[PDB]
Amino acid sequence: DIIIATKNGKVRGMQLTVFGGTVTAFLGIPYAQPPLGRLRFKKPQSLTKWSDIWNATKYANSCCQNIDQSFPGFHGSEMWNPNTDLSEDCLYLNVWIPAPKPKNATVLIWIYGGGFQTGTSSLHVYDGKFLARVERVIVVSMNYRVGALGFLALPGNPEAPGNMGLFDQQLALQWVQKNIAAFGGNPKSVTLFGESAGAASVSLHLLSPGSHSLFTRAILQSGSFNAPWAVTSLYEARNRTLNLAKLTGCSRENETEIIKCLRNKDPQEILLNEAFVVPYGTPLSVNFGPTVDGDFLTDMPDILLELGQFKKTQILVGVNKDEGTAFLVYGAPGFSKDNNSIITRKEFQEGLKIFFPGVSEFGKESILFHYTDWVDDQRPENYREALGDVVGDYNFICPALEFTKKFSEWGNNAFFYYFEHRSSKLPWPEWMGVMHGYEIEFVFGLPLERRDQYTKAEEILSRSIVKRWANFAKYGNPQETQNQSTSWPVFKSTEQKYLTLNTESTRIMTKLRAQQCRFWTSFFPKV
Ligand SMILES: *[C@@H]1O[C@H](CO[C@@H]2O[C@@H](C)[C@@H](O)[C@@H](O)[C@@H]2O)[C@@H](O[C@@H]2O[C@H](CO)[C@@H](O)[C@H](O)[C@H]2NC(C)=O)[C@H](O)[C@H]1NC(C)=O
Ligand SMILES: *[C@@H]1O[C@H](CO[C@@H]2O[C@@H](C)[C@@H](O)[C@@H](O)[C@@H]2O)[C@@H](O[C@@H]2O[C@H](CO)[C@@H](O)[C@H](O)[C@H]2NC(C)=O)[C@H](O)[C@H]1NC(C)=O
Ligand SMILES: *[C@@H]1O[C@H](CO[C@@H]2O[C@@H](C)[C@@H](O)[C@@H](O)[C@@H]2O)[C@@H](O[C@@H]2O[C@H](CO)[C@@H](O)[C@H](O)[C@H]2NC(C)=O)[C@H](O)[C@H]1NC(C)=O
Ligand SMILES: CC(C)(C)C[NH2+]C[C@@H](O)[C@H](Cc1ccccc1)NC(=O)C(c1ccccc1)c1ccccc1
Ligand SMILES: *[C@@H]1O[C@H](CO[C@@H]2O[C@@H](C)[C@@H](O)[C@@H](O)[C@@H]2O)[C@@H](O)[C@H](O)[C@H]1NC(C)=O
Ligand SMILES: CC(=O)N[C@H]1[C@H]([C@H](O)[C@H](O)CO)O[C@@](O)(C(=O)O)C[C@@H]1O
Ligand SMILES: *[C@@H]1O[C@H](CO)[C@@H](O)[C@H](O)[C@H]1NC(C)=O
Ligand SMILES: *[C@@H]1O[C@H](CO)[C@@H](O)[C@H](O)[C@H]1NC(C)=O
């Protein structure tokens, strides 16, 4: 029985058997007073000391959120759905501690994705016990508010200022600064890592001055704030805040009076109307996302990035080979996860309309022109693959590369990876390839568990990835120095070298998606 004295009280954990060893888990430590009642839509508020022993032995409530029901019973979609009760009382974090208790361990803080509308830290694929066991780091993860409850914006109005979920993340990094030493952890050696909107979140903490002293280094898996889906304009945010008021009968003239109205509505009523605040949306639609609030974010982040206004430190950034495919089976015509989804030119063009709704006829033709120059014109999957590349290059790969270029231009070491292994346990069909989100289990070390039917080559790939992630958090340098491994070079704006991650030949390559990204990063912003 291990009890830890934190700043606000004692917490009891629990023991776990991992690989003939022991990890100490603290699941469900509160880090803010529950944002209920008059606290809904507001920045998170500090906790009051408890004199008893807090029992942190089970994952806490997930935050309120809509669920993906597009494939009931299918593990491929449902593995991402919340696995604890939804509740507005959801501001909790988890801590995995090596046993024996470490003395000054590096801390890894995980921030989940979910498009800022969904997600939870209790997912099986986010279990931090393998990393604590195998690398003797401490793994922390937190729940943060999501959707309207986390990102509703009336700028300047502290009843609904925006970016609340980001301030939730920040208050948990805060908790680690005040408390992780009591757990054996080094508050001066804290690496943030996250995927999808979690990675975009990590990139925004690099930008937010209030977060600059709360971490050391940063890892961005398939996401960054300059991705088109990652920041909600103040224009959209107003229209979206107002439209939500209409759909709930909360339209008022006094703006603070609207919030008070929205505070009486039941959680499900806010959730149900979230989906309709956007007239024409995409499968990627971030209804309520990060905004330029003037608090967490002082200016438009493209400007801060371009002019070097961010925390100076090392970054590790990467993307997966087929980022874009997962979104095609959520609306694109001719697509299904249950067939090979051979689409025609006309279906492709219809697909562009779904993913670029408010884009001119000429914009859509330019995408078609740039992606329909086939090496062979007789390949039937030509249009199926091109639509995936469009979505993945536009929404993920090119923004990540551009983020890495601009960030490294200010003198810091950057490392970029290209993950191209398709999991042997992947429930989605083979034509979707190396999907968005399916590097996560390798980062967290799930194939290190021999019982789990991953191949041996997958064990070795995870083992190396886990070593490189830990070496990056510990020492700023994602090498595997012992076994005779390919050395990972720094990413520089001239050479743009990156490391490929796969079971076979790990290689050094240059200028990923160069032709594709000059289209998206240089030409397409004009249309
Ligand atoms: C725990 O270790 C820290 C040092 O952490 C390292 O240095 C960081 C800058 C960063 O590079 C991390 O990834 C490293 O692991 C100790 O911090 C020092 O504490 C003394 C206080 O006596 C202070 O005078 C020094 O300035 C601190 N910084 C450094 C760089 O030495 C800390 O004391 C250690 N604590 C325990 C309990 O072991
Ligand atoms: C800004 O909002 C207006 C209206 O808000 C919502 O529109 C629908 C999505 C509905 O679900 C309700 O929440 C609100 O009425 C948008 O204007 C609508 O646009 C659609 C098509 O673009 C049109 O068919 C409707 O008649 C319009 N309704 C009104 C009242 O104008 C508008 O498009 C949003 N965006 C911008 C940039 O103005
Ligand atoms: C691949 O499947 C899509 C989706 O169709 C659904 O899923 C199938 C597996 C099957 O169970 C169908 O009954 C389902 O409707 C097919 O697209 C549909 O094609 C039909 C007939 O041409 C058309 O009426 C629908 O509008 C299409 N639906 C969508 C969402 O596009 C597609 O034709 C299949 N392609 C191949 C190569 O198998
Ligand atoms: C794996 C991950 C942790 C990333 C999420 N698990 C999948 C599921 O929970 C959520 C549900 C959702 C849907 C729409 C808006 C918000 C959330 N889907 C995504 O998060 C993802 C996406 C995948 C496929 C089809 C559409 C969307 C995305 C959404 C917005 C921006 C970028 C990616
Ligand atoms: C918190 O937990 C206390 C201990 O209960 C037991 O603790 C360990 C040693 C395990 O055996 C565990 O499975 C047991 O449940 C309780 O005595 C205490 O009442 C609990 N407090 C609250 C508020 O629930
Ligand atoms: C048709 C259906 O509902 N499920 C089928 C799945 C799906 O197509 C998955 O998305 C891809 O595993 O694929 C199988 O054929 C397969 O190879 O295991 C089994 C099953 O018949
Ligand atoms: C709106 O209502 C709040 C609370 O009653 C009040 O403090 C504020 O001054 C009002 N503003 C306007 C413009 O009516
Ligand atoms: C290096 O290889 C040995 C086998 O000789 C293996 O046990 C170990 O886990 C490997 N280390 C890494 C970091 O992959």
Going by alpha carbons, the residue nearest to atom 17 of ligand 6 is 429
Going by alpha carbons, the residue nearest to atom 14 of ligand 8 is 464
Going by alpha carbons, the residue nearest to atom 14 of ligand 7 is 254
Q: What is the 3-state secondary structure (H, E, C) of 192-243?
A: EEEECHHHHHHHHHHHCHHHCCCCCEEEEECCCCCCCCCCCCHHHHHHHHHH
Rounded Cα–Cα distance for residues 284 and 184 (Å): 40
- Resolution number, Å: 2.2
Helix, strand, or coil here: 405? Answer: helix
Q: Is the CB of 186 under 6 A from ligand 1?
A: yes
Helix, strand, or coil here: 457? Answer: helix
Rounded Cα–Cα distance for residues 296 and 368 (Å): 38
Q: How far is the CA of 156 from the centre of ligand 7 (A)?
A: 14
Query: Using the 8-state DSSP alphabet, how is residue 486 labeled?
Result: P
> According to the entry, how was the structure determined?
X-ray
Rounded Cα–Cα distance for residues 204 and 369 (Å): 34
436 is catalytic: yes
Quick one: which of 125, 17, 122 has its CA closest to 454? 125
State the ligand closest to the CA atom of 73: 6
Q: Phi then psi for 108, rounded to 5 degrees?
A: -105, 120
> To 10 degrees, what angle do helices 382-392 and 345-355 make?
20
Query: Hey, which residues does 510 pair with through a beta bridge?
Result: 497
Biggest distance spanned by C-alpha atoms of the chain: 72
Helix, strand, or coil here: 93? Answer: strand
Rounded Cα–Cα distance for residues 372 and 386 (Å): 7
196 is catalytic: yes
Q: How far is the CA of 28 from the centre of ligand 5 (A)?
A: 14
Q: Is the CB of 327 under 6 A from ligand 4?
A: yes
State the ligand closest to the CA atom of 482: 8
Going by alpha carbons, the residue nearest to atom 3 of ligand 5 is 55
Quick one: which of 405, 196, 163 has its CA closest to 306? 405
- The whole-angstrom distance between residue 505's C-alpha and the CA centroid of its chain comes to 28
448 close to 455: Cβ distance less than 8 angstroms: no
Q: How far is the CA of 103 from the centre of ligand 3 (A)?
A: 58
Query: Hey, which residues does 498 pair with through a beta bridge?
Result: 509
Number of domains present in the structure of the chain: 1
- Whole domain around residue 447: which residue ranges? 1-527
Q: In sequence order, what are the residues at sequence separation of 6 or more whose Cβ sits closer than 8 angstroms to the Cβ of residue 192?
A: 109, 111, 173, 202, 205, 215, 217, 218, 219
Active-site choice (135, 159, 195, 323): 323
Torsion of CA 44, 49, 53, 59, to 10 degrees: 0
Quick one: which of 85, 94, 40, 36 has its CA closest to 65? 85
Going by alpha carbons, the residue nearest to atom 1 of ligand 8 is 483
75 is catalytic: no
Residues flanking ligand 6, CB < 6 Å: 337-338, 427-429
Rounded Cα–Cα distance for residues 248 and 237 (Å): 17
Rounded Cα–Cα distance for residues 63 and 189 (Å): 28
Consult the annotation and say whether 114 binds a ligand.
Answer: yes
Query: Hey, which residues does 92 pair with through a beta bridge?
Result: 30
Q: Is the CB of 188 under 6 A from ligand 1?
A: yes
Rounded Cα–Cα distance for residues 359 and 374 (Å): 24
Active-site choice (141, 196, 341, 423): 196
Structure tokens given for 193: 């890592």
Going by alpha carbons, the residue nearest to atom 11 of ligand 7 is 254
Residues flanking ligand 5, CB < 6 Å: 1, 55
Quick one: which of 283, 367, 287, 286 has its CA closest to 329? 283
Structure tokens given for 475: 């020492």
Rounded Cα–Cα distance for residues 491 and 499 (Å): 9
What sign for the dihedral angle of Cα 353, 357, 362, 368?
negative
Query: Order of strands across the sheet with 10-12?
Result: 3-5, 10-12, 53-55
Consult the annotation and say whether 115 binds a ligand.
Answer: yes
Q: How far is the CA of 486 from the centre of ligand 8 (A)?
A: 14
Q: What is the 3-state secondary structure (H, E, C) of 487-501?
A: CCCCCCCCCCEEEEE
Pocket test for ligand 2, best of 234, 236, 239 (most atoms within 8 A of CB): 239
Residue type at position 154: L
Quick one: which of 7, 4, 3, 101 has its CA closest to 46? 7
- The whole-angstrom distance between residue 504's C-alpha and the CA centroid of its chain comes to 27
Helix, strand, or coil here: 181? Answer: helix
Rounded Cα–Cα distance for residues 57 and 290 (Å): 32
